[PDB]
Design a protein around this ligand. Structure first.
Ligand SMILES: CN(C)C(=O)c1ccc(Nc2cc3c(cn2)cc(-c2cnco2)n3C(=O)OC(C)(C)C)c(Cl)c1
Length: 253
């Protein structure tokens, strides 16, 4: 099986994953270099959906020059029938990696955490709030974490959902909470509310101040401060990304 993107021929090795409308493959160019190709069928796509797809591609393209913590998009082919996106190949998504890895190295965690802040910080600088941050969004590329999507594409788990989202029934700070849950998972092996199976009661716990989130004593006092600061229910009281970037946990070994 083979495909053509802007004149260049790509041999398919395997399908990495498949969404609703789209499919991602592990491919090879004529010089036997590896890439990931996102193929999106546009036959059933409506105007709003087409525009949201065009918008994420635009941002992914502009944000290339601003941060290397954003997945590389080398080429793309857009017609009325499909989209082909030529990207760099990552080893594994952070979610699938965390499911396999029971115990995480404190150095790896610090490194991945700084990467996530850099990627999320970049999208904020451009006025984008992902609003749906998850481990899955992040890709391990040569021991570096890279942000895969910006949330704009999505809508074509609730364990990472901020309280202000459920209470409103969203700002840079909504992403802070979600990142804080990713780090809480990377620290305690569980998300702050994983323990609640009933999805109704879970949402109640996320918005309830009487529900005190546990922060068991860990040898990294700075990491525990990061977690307490990120998981503040009041967005006004919650720490910011530029602040998190100067925190001793990020900046000191
Ligand atoms: C069990 N899983 C799936 C793995 O072990 C595994 C995960 C990721 C991989 N690499 C990869 C995935 C990629 C990209 C580059 N490289 C680019 C994207 C992408 C899609 N929209 C924007 O960007 N993308 C993506 O959506 O991937 C999934 C579907 C896994 C999130 C590989 Cl080879 C294996």
């Amino acid at each position: 099986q083979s495909m053509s993107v802007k004149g260049r021929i790509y041999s398919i090795l395997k399908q990495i994953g498949s969404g609703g409308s789209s499919k991602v493959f592990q491919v090879l160019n004529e010089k036997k270099q590896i890439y990931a190709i996102k193929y999106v069928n546009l036959e059933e796509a409506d105007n709003q959906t087409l525009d949201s797809y065009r918008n994420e591609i635009a941002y992914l393209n502009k944000l290339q020059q601003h941060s290397d913590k954003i997945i590389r998009l080398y080429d793309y082919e857009i017609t009325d029938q499909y989209i082909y996106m030529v990207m760099e190949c990552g080893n594994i998504d952070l979610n699938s990696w965390l499911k396999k890895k029971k115990s995480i190295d404190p150095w790896e965690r610090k490194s991945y955490w700084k990467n996530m802040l850099e990627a999320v910080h970049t999208i904020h600088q451009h006025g984008i709030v992902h609003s749906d941050l998850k481990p899955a969004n992040f890709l391990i590329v040569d021991g570096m974490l890279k942000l895969i999507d910006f949330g704009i594409a999505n809508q074509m788990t609730v364990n990472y959902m901020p309280p202000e989202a459920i209470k409103d029934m969203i700002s840079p700070k909504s992403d802070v909470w979600s990142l804080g849950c990713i780090l809480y998972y990377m620290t305690y092996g569980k998300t702050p509310f994983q323990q609640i199976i009933n999805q109704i009661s879970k949402l109640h716990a996320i918005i309830d101040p009487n529900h005190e989130i546990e922060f068991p004593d860990i040898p990294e006092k700075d990491l525990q401060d990061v977690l307490k600061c990120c998981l503040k229910r009041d967005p006004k009281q919650r720490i910011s990304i530029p602040e998190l970037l100067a925190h001793p946990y990020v900046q000191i070994q």
